[PDB]
Design a protein around this nucleic acid. Structure first.
Ligand SMILES: [Mn+2]
Ligand SMILES: [Mn+2]
Ligand SMILES: [Mn+2]
Ligand SMILES: [Mn+2]
Ligand SMILES: [Mn+2]
Ligand SMILES: [Mn+2]
Ligand SMILES: [Mn+2]
Ligand SMILES: [Mn+2]
Ligand SMILES: [Mn+2]
Ligand SMILES: [Mn+2]
Ligand SMILES: [Mn+2]
Ligand SMILES: [Mn+2]
Ligand SMILES: [Mn+2]
Ligand SMILES: [Mn+2]
Ligand SMILES: [Mn+2]
Ligand SMILES: [Mn+2]
Ligand SMILES: [Mn+2]
Ligand SMILES: [Mn+2]
Ligand SMILES: [Mn+2]
Ligand SMILES: [Mn+2]
Ligand SMILES: [Mn+2]
Ligand SMILES: [Mn+2]
Ligand SMILES: [Mn+2]
Ligand SMILES: [Mn+2]
Ligand SMILES: [Mn+2]
Ligand SMILES: [Mn+2]
Ligand SMILES: [Mn+2]
Ligand SMILES: [Mn+2]
Ligand SMILES: [Mn+2]
Ligand SMILES: [Mn+2]
Ligand SMILES: [Mn+2]
Ligand SMILES: [Mn+2]
Ligand SMILES: [Mn+2]
Ligand SMILES: [Mn+2]
Ligand SMILES: [Mn+2]
Ligand SMILES: [Mn+2]
Ligand SMILES: [Mn+2]
Ligand SMILES: [Mn+2]
Ligand SMILES: [Mn+2]
Ligand SMILES: [Mn+2]
Ligand SMILES: [Mn+2]
Ligand SMILES: [Mn+2]
Ligand SMILES: [Mn+2]
Ligand SMILES: [Mn+2]
Ligand SMILES: [Mn+2]
Lengths: 79, 99, 99, 106, 99, 87, 104, 99
DNA sequence: ATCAATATCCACCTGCAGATACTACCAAAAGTGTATTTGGAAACTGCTCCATCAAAAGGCATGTTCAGCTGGATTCCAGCTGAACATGCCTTTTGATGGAGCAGTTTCCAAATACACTTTTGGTAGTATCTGCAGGTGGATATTGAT
DNA sequence: ATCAATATCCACCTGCAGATACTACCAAAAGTGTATTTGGAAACTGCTCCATCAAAAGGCATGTTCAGCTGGAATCCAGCTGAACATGCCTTTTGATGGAGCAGTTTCCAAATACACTTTTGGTAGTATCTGCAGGTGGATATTGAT
């Protein structure tokens, strides 16, 4: 599993929050592949900040800074 | 008791003060306070970063309040910019005419 | 006759429910497994602040939720009401994510 | 310490802190006296606007404590704040109630 | 008898031609007047270095050309080959230029 | 000896054929009749924004002449970086 | 002996070093920073002139012009992402017509 | 020598050197060289800017070749990064081995 | 139209997470006084280049006509996707315990800044001469579309 | 497939705009060489909070059935839009002009940084009490979907 751990009902609930009424059966594989590409992009950057600071822990700050430079600024975890 | 105290400063108490002036009977959750802290840090970085750019373009070494003003104009939506300029000019006046 | 709802009635009911709540919509642990596995490709032996994993989830969910808004627009544009992979593909291309 | 620069400027936002943050910021070689005053006023103003609107959003929902959700409704219902924060995600804010009309019954 | 190409043939001929060249496609002088007209509505008694006007034109043409690519993708999505205003609109909404 | 005629309605100087040519570079084969007025509206909004910022830079530098650098900095900050004109 | 020749570089280390100070990027600039940055700048210059040069040779020309830069960047996946939000004046676009638009 | 116009520096002679290395019989138009010049300044500001941010994030007042390297990894994609990192390390190594 | 089945709503209720309040304490922040320095405004003006004008001429815009073929409307149906129900398997929680490793602290040296004096260079400038290719011709071969 | 109208191809050419080559000059850049200062790596370690269990408790996912209703295919036709044509005007191009305003150089002081010194405050920590609102209940009534 793992990626398959992001389930059909989970994706459906997301879509619903996005205002989607009717969903094609192939949307589930497309979505998972999309999520994986998002996370790789972000995590790569976060882990890069982590390596730089010579740590072995990815910190919220590392994630927040990765999000900022991918133009996806996040508020709430900057403590 | 100074050891495990690397001062983690935030705008939280100043946010809190402003809250009480506009909504004296309303509280604010921690997570919400955190959002606001991030908000103020973000706008600070955008404004200052932009003023820095202005200074370099014009071959200057000083970020003055004129640079903060132009930055605000360039960065805030029309009407929100008009008010910000107004608040800024106001506080730079009162500051001068003070002791 | 046992009671049944027309297709799409419960769909609407859920859109209204989930657009009202703010709780996260992916289960917490499977997500964590996923994150840890992807990161393992970039560096072995990692550890994650729990708030680090929470940040990724918030960002991911806000990302997919907005992509679905855009995807929905693409389906509706082609006079459908069913979102399809080509709708996701078109939205991402126009956003410059594929292009 | 006589009077704070914030009281002088008539503000609740820490002028001295803003000044210091400019210097260590590596934004410029030097820093005019008026500049952190202006900047502090601007930050205070913008903070007031959001708390004001998010406050209203708490009334409408029969609540007296502002939570993230309220900041999200405040920002997204306001044309100007929404543009300023157009590339920002507020954690635990959710989204605005919105259904495309073509998806409505009959 | 008199010769005619079928509809669409000259259109494709022109795509090949215009995708092969790099010259600007809006006439110089009328574009200059537009820039001066818009500028003067913001501020009177402004002047322009000529390469400033060229800079706006090069930018504006790169922008519109890329918009028509996106618009073209939206049409095709709707199974048409004719771009309509709603295709320009959907492209701009997805690009984040609108909503 | 001093001129400056009133400038009005120069958006119509973005002629139908100029728009057609732009669409072609864009790989567009067929064009609906209402596209022209829509495109003019879209150019007007794009120019207003770039010019507003460009003139903001100029004024700040206390100049009366918009420079290529003004326009180039205006473009960068809206994330349409332009190469070829300085900076 | 210049720092450039000492680092094995065509690109000017002293100048890069100087621009690093002028720019206010940090309180201090360590000695290796400009040398590394000049190395990266020279490598990217090299990679794009390699590819533009070919584009020029492909159109029977000996002088690189902006079209050739644009061709080189857009035809290369990685330079295309790095310069994804950049407009190259006088570059035009890639020959590219969507399939459904062709006759049969 | 008219009241000396203050000197305007560019990377042209440098770009030119590299050009003669990769294409010994090829010229470059001065408009092309202007693009190359913008390209080199663009990439410099992007790398130094990331570096700047890195330094701050870690409470460091010094931009080292380590900061430039991480910046390069963050900013450039895939194979460009691997080679750039490589030419950087090599150059630094060579430089410190002298004297 | 009737009328049943479910959802959704509002009023009220109570435990408890998380917010609030007081007190003690303390580094590092901020103000303040005073000695030194310098950024960049003021004033004067040299010299680039913008606005403007003139005149000529042809590349291209405008407006029309005509009909090809596209979009938009209608109908139709096979099948995909929603709803519901029955399992049961895994996520959540919550508590509790090692121990990784982030973060505080002290020590110290390699490396950064400051500075002075000496050399080297890239940019400009002035003046003079090559050369790659745009654009023109002419004639040959390729594509399109009527039969 | 034959055939004719027209676009497209490419070899050939020639002006000239832009590229290139030389000398000459020099203000700023760059390197060198000492003196003075310090950032942050190094080692050691205390304490936060991260990974990992155990352990029910059930909420939530999965699998399957069944049919409503949507997507996509097929059919038609009205008129929108592309192609070609005629006419002529306004952009383009070339060359000259006064002069606005950008930009260089020098003088010079209001306001910056630099440093010491006293006073203040926001953050952390410990211990105690308070309360807004999630989550439960009940009962009204609205919505949906079958007749
Ligand atoms: Mn109020
Ligand atoms: Mn039921
Ligand atoms: Mn006007
Ligand atoms: Mn009833
Ligand atoms: Mn009721
Ligand atoms: Mn009731
Ligand atoms: Mn509770
Ligand atoms: Mn508690
Ligand atoms: Mn108490
Ligand atoms: Mn201090
Ligand atoms: Mn000075
Ligand atoms: Mn000066
Ligand atoms: Mn004076
Ligand atoms: Mn006419
Ligand atoms: Mn016919
Ligand atoms: Mn007909
Ligand atoms: Mn007709
Ligand atoms: Mn059709
Ligand atoms: Mn059927
Ligand atoms: Mn089917
Ligand atoms: Mn069928
Ligand atoms: Mn340890
Ligand atoms: Mn440390
Ligand atoms: Mn080192
Ligand atoms: Mn010294
Ligand atoms: Mn030289
Ligand atoms: Mn010569
Ligand atoms: Mn030619
Ligand atoms: Mn011919
Ligand atoms: Mn021939
Ligand atoms: Mn010629
Ligand atoms: Mn130290
Ligand atoms: Mn230190
Ligand atoms: Mn040691
Ligand atoms: Mn059926
Ligand atoms: Mn349908
Ligand atoms: Mn359909
Ligand atoms: Mn019709
Ligand atoms: Mn003809
Ligand atoms: Mn002509
Ligand atoms: Mn004057
Ligand atoms: Mn001043
Ligand atoms: Mn206090
Ligand atoms: Mn409730
Ligand atoms: Mn009940």
């Amino acid at each position: 599993d793992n990626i398959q751990g992001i389930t059909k009902p989970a994706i459906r609930r997301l879509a619903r929050r996005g205002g989607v009424k009717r969903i094609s059966g192939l949307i589930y594989e497309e979505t998972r592949g999309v999520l994986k590409v998002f996370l790789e992009n972000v995590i790569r950057d976060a882990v890069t900040y982590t390596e730089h600071a010579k740590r072995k822990t990815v910190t919220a700050m590392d994630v927040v800074y990765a999000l900022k430079r991918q133009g996806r600024t996040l508020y709430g975890f900057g403590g | 008791k100074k050891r495990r105290k690397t001062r983690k400063e935030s705008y939280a108490i100043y946010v809190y003060k402003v809250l009480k002036q506009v909504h004296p009977d309303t509280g604010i959750s921690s997570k919400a306070m955190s959002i606001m802290n991030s908000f103020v840090n973000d706008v600070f970085e955008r404004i200052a970063g932009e003023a820095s750019r202005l200074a370099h373009y014009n071959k200057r070494s000083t970020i003055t309040s004129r640079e903060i003003q132009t930055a605000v104009r360039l960065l805030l939506p029309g009407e929100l910019a008009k008010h910000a300029v107004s608040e800024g000019t106001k506080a730079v006046t009162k500051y001068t005419s003070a002791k | 006759k046992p009671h049944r709802y027309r297709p799409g009635t419960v769909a609407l009911r859920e859109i209204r429910r989930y657009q009202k709540s703010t709780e996260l919509l992916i289960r917490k642990l499977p997500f964590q497994r996923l994150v840890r596995e992807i990161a393992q490709d970039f560096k072995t032996d990692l550890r994650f602040q729990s708030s680090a994993v929470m940040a990724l989830q918030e960002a991911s969910e806000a990302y997919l939720v907005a992509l679905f808004e855009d995807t929905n627009l693409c389906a509706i544009h082609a006079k459908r009401v069913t979102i399809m992979p080509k709708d996701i593909q078109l939205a991402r291309r126009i956003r410059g994510e594929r292009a | 310490k006589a009077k704070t620069r914030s009281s002088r400027a008539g503000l609740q936002f820490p002028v001295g802190r803003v000044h210091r943050l400019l210097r260590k910021g590596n934004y410029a070689e030097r820093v005019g006296a008026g500049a952190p005053v202006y900047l502090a006023a601007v930050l205070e103003y913008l903070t007031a606007e959001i708390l004001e609107l998010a406050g209203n959003a708490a009334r409408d929902n029969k609540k007296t404590r502002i939570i993230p959700r309220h900041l999200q409704l405040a920002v997204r219902n306001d044309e100007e704040l929404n543009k300023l924060l157009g590339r920002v995600t507020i954690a635990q804010g959710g989204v605005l109630p919105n259904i495309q009309s073509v998806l409505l019954p009959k």
